[PDB]
Structures are given as C-alpha cells and as structure tokens.
Paper text:
Here, we crystalized Nei2 and determined its structure at 1.45 Å resolution. The refined Nei2 model (Rwork/Rfree = 16.7/20.5) comprised a continuous polypeptide from Pro2 to Ala251. There was no density for the N-terminal methionine, which we presume was removed by methionine aminopeptidase during Nei2 expression in E. coli. The protein consists of an N-terminal lobe (aa 2–116) and a C-terminal lobe (aa 123–251) connected by a linker peptide. The N lobe is built around two four-strand antiparallel β-sheets (β1↑•β6↓•β7↑•β5↓ and β2↑•β3↓•β4↑•β8↓) that form a β-sandwich, which is flanked by the N-terminal α1 helix and two short 310 helices. The C domain comprises a 4-helix bundle, a β9-β10 hairpin, and a tetracysteine-zinc complex. A strong anomalous difference peak was detected overlying the modeled zinc atom. Weaker anomalous peaks were detected over the Sγ atoms of Cys225, Cys228, Cys245, and Cys248 that bind the zinc ion. The N and C lobes are arranged in a saddle-like shape with a deep groove between them, in which the N-terminal proline (Pro2) is located, thereby demarcating the AP lyase active site. The saddle groove is lined by positive electrostatic potential that provides a docking site for the DNA substrate, as seen in structures of AP lyase-related enzymes.
M. smegmatis Nei2, so named by virtue of its homology to Escherichia coli endonuclease VIII (Nei), is a 252-aa monomeric enzyme with AP β-lyase activity on single-stranded DNA. The lhr–nei2 gene operon of Mycobacterium tuberculosis and its avirulent relative Mycobacterium smegmatis encodes a pair of enzymes implicated in DNA repair: the Lhr helicase and the Nei2 AP lyase (1–4). Expression of Nei2, and its operonic neighbor Lhr (a tetrameric 3′-to-5′ helicase), is induced in mycobacteria exposed to DNA damaging agents. We demonstrate here that Nei2 has 5-hydroxyuracil glycosylase/β-lyase activity on single-stranded DNA.
Numbering used by the authors: 2 to 251
Write the structure that this text describes.
C-alpha cells in the first residue's frame, strides 16, 4: 500500500464507521485483547501517510497497511490472511487483515506516533516547498531512496517511485542533484497520488482503461507509451525497478 491506497481505505472505513456507535470491537492482537470500544462512537477515521487512525472514545486504533486490501468492508469473512481486528456497527462490518502494526493508542496523543513524517502527499495541509527542500537537501542522495523516505514526504511507494522516475526522465539511481526543479517533482507526486485518492485502479497516464494505466511499472518488455522502446527491469536491491532506456538515460 502506497499513500493513495491508505487514504482510500480511510475513506472506505469512514463510510462504514464514522459517526456511528461501535457494536463490536474485537482486537485479535495479544497486547490489546482486552480493548473493547463497543459503545463508543467512531468520531473520526484519518490517514497520515501510509498510516491509518480510527478514533473512538478515548482510544485511537493505529494500523500500518502492508497489504493491499488490508481493510475489508462487508459481511464476507473469508480472507487470504489472518483477521487481526473486527469492528462492527448496527449495519456494517470492517475487518483488518495482514496488518503490519495494529495497536490501540491514547487518542489525545495519537499523532505523536507519526510526528516525524514529512508532508503528507494526501494530507489536508500539504506543503510542496517543504517536501521539495527535503528532497533536495542532500543532492548526492539517490533519487528513488529520497522519494521513498517518509521523512522527506509521506505517501510514495515502489509503484509511484517507478512512475515518477519515468515522467522526469531519470533512472532511480540518479542523484537528486540532477533534477532541474525539485518543486516540480513533488508537485507532480502530489498530483499523481491525488488523482488516485479514490481510485483503486491506479492510473498515472490519464488513461484508466485496462492495460493503459501506468507508464512503466509492471510493464517489462512492453513498449514505452511515448517513444516505443521496450521497457527494461532490474530486480537487484530491495525493490523491482522498471524504466524506459530511451526516456530515462544516465
Ligand atoms: Zn520511452
């Protein structure tokens, strides 16, 4: 999950839970087995970068999504991974599966958990100059590592990292110092995530149709949509990269 998925999940949970009294709060995490927020209203569901917070009563349920489809809404219980939490209201059910962190924090201090985050690409008070100065603060830093650092700005994961590198004509190992305009980079990242904040069908090309949605990610061996050259890929290091060797040069 990247920042768009997490924001969208927060929105889906808001539709299911926000403003409603919890009828069930079953936290299947050992330290939190005794938490039972039933009888409290879910006052707010919000995202902070790749983090989710569910505020109810005096508590804030903090989760960090490692798996797409991590929170599921509806009454179907069959799932590919372990159910870690069930929340219900009179009319709705939300289940959290394969969550990374799932913890119950004090509501009043819940933002201390994530106060170090850089500007949130999908947060209400986004600040592109802060993100741009953070991104450019160390010009010898490799571009992809800087984009993926949640203290620089919050929300880019491997898909958006690959896509941003393509639209700016840079290899992921290019130093940030080679960017003509770091402000433009972070503004385009904001625009890309914003366009997908309510779209699970992640699209960066402007064309949402099947097979048309991304420039390079997941497209090894397919033609670049601009120059026609076949897309290349490398699976060394942490993350898989995809790039057009004509549009993205050293
Ligand atoms: Zn190309």
């Amino acid at each position: 999950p990247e920042g768009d998925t997490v924001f969208h999940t927060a929105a889906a949970l808001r539709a299911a839970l926000e403003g409603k009294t919890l009828t069930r709060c079953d936290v299947r995490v050992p330290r939190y087995a005794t938490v039972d927020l039933s009888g409290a209203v879910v006052d707010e569901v919000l995202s902070r970068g790749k983090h989710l917070f569910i505020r109810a009563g005096s508590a804030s349920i903090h989760s960090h999504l490692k798996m797409e489809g991590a929170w599921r809404i509806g009454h179907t219980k069959v799932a590919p991974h372990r159910i870690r939490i069930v929340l219900e209201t009179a009319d709705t059910r939300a289940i959290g599966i394969d969550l990374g962190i799932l913890e119950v924090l004090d509501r009043g201090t819940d933002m201390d958990a994530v106060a170090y985050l850089g500007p949130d690409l999908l947060g209400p008070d986004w600040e592109p100059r802060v993100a741009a100065d953070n991104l450019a603060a160390d010009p010898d830093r490799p571009l992809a590592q800087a984009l993926l650092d949640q203290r620089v700005m919050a929300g880019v994961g491997n898909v958006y990292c690959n896509e941003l590198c393509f639209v700016f004509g840079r290899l992921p190992t290019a130093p940030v110092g080679t960017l003509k305009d770091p402000l433009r980079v972070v503004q385009r990242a904001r625009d890309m995530l914003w366009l997908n904040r309510s779209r699970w069908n992640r699209t960066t090309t402007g064309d949402t149709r099947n097979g048309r949605q991304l420039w390079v990610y997941g497209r090894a061996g397919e033609p670049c949509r601009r120059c026609g050259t076949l897309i290349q890929t490398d699976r060394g290091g942490e993350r898989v990269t995809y790039w057009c060797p004509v549009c993205q040069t050293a």
